[PDB]
Amino acid sequence: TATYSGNPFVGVTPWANAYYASEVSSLAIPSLTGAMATAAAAVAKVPSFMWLDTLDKTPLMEQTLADIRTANKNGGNYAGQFVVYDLPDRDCAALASNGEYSIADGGVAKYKNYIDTIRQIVVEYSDIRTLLVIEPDSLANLVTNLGTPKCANAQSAYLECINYAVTQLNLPNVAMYLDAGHAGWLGWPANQDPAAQLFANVYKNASSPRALRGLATNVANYNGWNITSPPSYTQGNAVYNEKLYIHAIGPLLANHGWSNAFFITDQGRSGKQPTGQQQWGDWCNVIGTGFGIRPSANTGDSLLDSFVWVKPGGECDGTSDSSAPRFDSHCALPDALQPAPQAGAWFQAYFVQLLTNANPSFL
Ligand SMILES: CO[C@@H]1O[C@H](CO)[C@@H](O[C@@H]2O[C@H](CO)[C@@H](S[C@@H]3O[C@H](CO)[C@@H](O[C@@H]4O[C@H](CO)[C@@H](O)[C@H](O)[C@H]4O)[C@H](O)[C@H]3O)[C@H](O)[C@H]2O)[C@H](O)[C@H]1O
Numbered sequence: 001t002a003t004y005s006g007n008p009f010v011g012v013t014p015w016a017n018a019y020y021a022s023e024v025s026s027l028a029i030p031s032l033t034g035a036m037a038t039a040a041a042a043v044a045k046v047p048s049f050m051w052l053d054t055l056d057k058t059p060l061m062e063q064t065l066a067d068i069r070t071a072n073k074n075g076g077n078y079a080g081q082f083v084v085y086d087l088p089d090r091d092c093a094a095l096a097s098n099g100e101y102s103i104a105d106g107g108v109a110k111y112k113n114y115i116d117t118i119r120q121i122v123v124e125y126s127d128i129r130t131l132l133v134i135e136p137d138s139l140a141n142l143v144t145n146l147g148t149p150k151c152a153n154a155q156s157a158y159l160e161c162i163n164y165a166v167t168q169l170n171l172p173n174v175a176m177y178l179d180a181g182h183a184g185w186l187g188w189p190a191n192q193d194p195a196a197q198l199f200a201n202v203y204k205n206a207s208s209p210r211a212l213r214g215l216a217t218n219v220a221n222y223n224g225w226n227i228t229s230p231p232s233y234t235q236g237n238a239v240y241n242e243k244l245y246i247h248a249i250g251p252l253l254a255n256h257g258w259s260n261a262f263f264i265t266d267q268g269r270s271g272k273q274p275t276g277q278q279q280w281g282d283w284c285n286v287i288g289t290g291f292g293i294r295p296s297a298n299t300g301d302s303l304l305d306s307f308v309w310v311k312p313g314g315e316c317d318g319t320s321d322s323s324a325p326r327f328d329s330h331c332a333l334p335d336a337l338q339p340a341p342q343a344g345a346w347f348q349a350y351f352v353q354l355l356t357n358a359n360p361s362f363l
């Protein structure tokens with residue numbers, strides 16, 4: 001069993017999965033040449049999280065873990081990185097949810113079934129340290145979007161499902177980080193305490209799971225970790241980067257019963273600041289972005305366990321095709337790169353944008 005004490009990112013090396021590497025090497029590289037083609041090959045070596053966005057994706061988790069075990073037998077000392085993302089009525093505030101399960105149709109029961117598959121894999125592979133991000137774009141909606149019917153009506157289901165997940169996946173080789181939106185979402189002073197209270201309640205309600213290390217921020221977003229100047233779109237919010245956000249909500253977590261909570265922040269698309277966002281709330285395939293700070297535990301900051309790449313750069317946020325199912329108007333805005341494919345599908349021009357504007361640079 002891959003047990004640990006303190007920062008779960010220390011003493012191991014994040015595994016760069018074959019799934020993403022295949023996308024870059026087979027979907028991106030054949031389209032590139034020279035310096036760009038060579039720089040792209042390097043991107044595939046940067047470890048990023050594998051999303052378990054459907055039940056059909058679970059066999060891929062075992063395969064990935066099987067690969068890691070093989071590597072670790074040869075002294076690899078690698079850790080798996082996955083995202084649990086299949087809540088019923090998922091993305092309640094989104095103008096189009098791609099979730100396969102729905103509350104009305106036995107969604108909660110199907111979610112628990114999904115979690116059971118995952119626990120058995122983790123139990124089977126207890127020898128591998130597994131780092132997980134728990135349900136992005138879920139609890140954050142319950143803080144600011146209860147005005148939206150779907151979100152208000154998904155509350156109990158979200159909390160029950162999240163509870164089942166954190167308790168069932170509370171194992172010695174596991175480290176879970178609950179998604180907590182980002183500075184532009186829950187960072188605003190007015191949302192700080194309410195948000196901190198909800199996360200603290202999830203922790204305590206789950207019997208303070210030892211495997212629940214803390215929270216994940218900026219997942220699939222573009223905020224800078226420590227930028228020194230407030231971009232125009234953050235006007236009014238003193239908390240304009242992720243460092244300020246975790247340092248503001250951290251003590252509040254402690255005030256509400258959850259002490260020793262740490263964080264991980266996505267920087268996979270935070271390399272260029274300011275971004276091309278015309279409005280902070282614009283989240284779909286944002287123009288003017290690049291790969292950011294590389295995954296590492298050497299954060300020079302007490303509260304941040306590690307810089308991570310959760311949302312895999314190159315995989316689309318949503319389609320700009322207005323006739324397509326699940327079309328979200330946010331993906332057709334002037335600050336969104338178009339034309340864009342279905343969410344999760346490979347978006348070549350975006351990968352190229354990210355690679356071109358990368359910092360640290362790959363070229
Ligand atoms: C003004 O504040 C804003 O508030 C709104 C809430 O009303 C926030 O909007 C939300 O932003 C979220 C990101 O910050 C996105 S998440 C979005 O959808 C999913 C979940 O991350 C991602 O797609 C999935 O990607 C996986 C990996 O590529 C795939 O495996 C999977 O198949 C895909 O579905 C996508 O990349 C994300 O962009 C919410 O959708 C949105 O409502 C806003 O952030 C605040 O600023």
Ligand SMILES: *[C@@H]1O[C@H](CO)[C@@H](O)[C@H](O)[C@H]1NC(C)=O
Binds near residue numbers: 201
């Ligand atoms: C606590 O866990 C139970 C599990 O049945 C769940 O239904 C409930 O919503 C949770 N409460 C909170 C505040 O998370």
Ligand SMILES: *[C@@H]1O[C@H](CO)[C@@H](O)[C@H](O)[C@H]1NC(C)=O
Binds near residue numbers: 225226228293298300
């Ligand atoms: C922000 O963090 C990165 C990585 O830790 C570091 O290289 C950079 O110097 C930091 N910038 C500031 C202003 O602290």
Ligand SMILES: *[C@H]1O[C@H](CO)[C@@H](O)[C@H](O)[C@@H]1O
Binds near residue numbers: 002003004005
């Ligand atoms: C599990 O056990 C190992 C033994 O090496 C420890 O190093 C780890 O901290 C955890 O307690």
Ligand SMILES: *[C@H]1O[C@H](CO)[C@@H](O)[C@H](O)[C@@H]1O
Binds near residue numbers: 014076077
């Ligand atoms: C994980 O693996 C890397 C090699 O890529 C090491 O440098 C690190 O110390 C850890 O063993």
Ligand SMILES: *[C@H]1O[C@H](CO)[C@@H](O)[C@H](O)[C@@H]1O
Binds near residue numbers: 018019020022023027
């Ligand atoms: C490797 O895997 C990626 C992701 O599924 C594919 O897009 C590619 O065609 C290859 O099978």
Ligand SMILES: *[C@H]1O[C@H](CO)[C@@H](O)[C@H](O)[C@@H]1O
Binds near residue numbers: 025026042045
């Ligand atoms: C996909 O495959 C190519 C060629 O083998 C690599 O260069 C890249 O790093 C990724 O693994």
Ligand SMILES: *[C@H]1O[C@H](CO)[C@@H](O)[C@H](O)[C@@H]1O
Binds near residue numbers: 023025027
């Ligand atoms: C990307 O996928 C292709 C098949 O579509 C492979 O041939 C290649 O090695 C990489 O895995």
Ligand SMILES: *[C@H]1O[C@H](CO)[C@@H](O)[C@H](O)[C@@H]1O
Binds near residue numbers: 027028030031032348
């Ligand atoms: C890689 O990107 C090129 C565009 O430069 C495409 O033509 C190709 O089909 C692949 O998507």
Ligand SMILES: *[C@H]1O[C@H](CO)[C@@H](O)[C@H](O)[C@@H]1O
Binds near residue numbers: 033
């Ligand atoms: C990038 O550079 C590599 C060698 O470093 C080449 O093999 C490739 O063709 C591209 O020019």
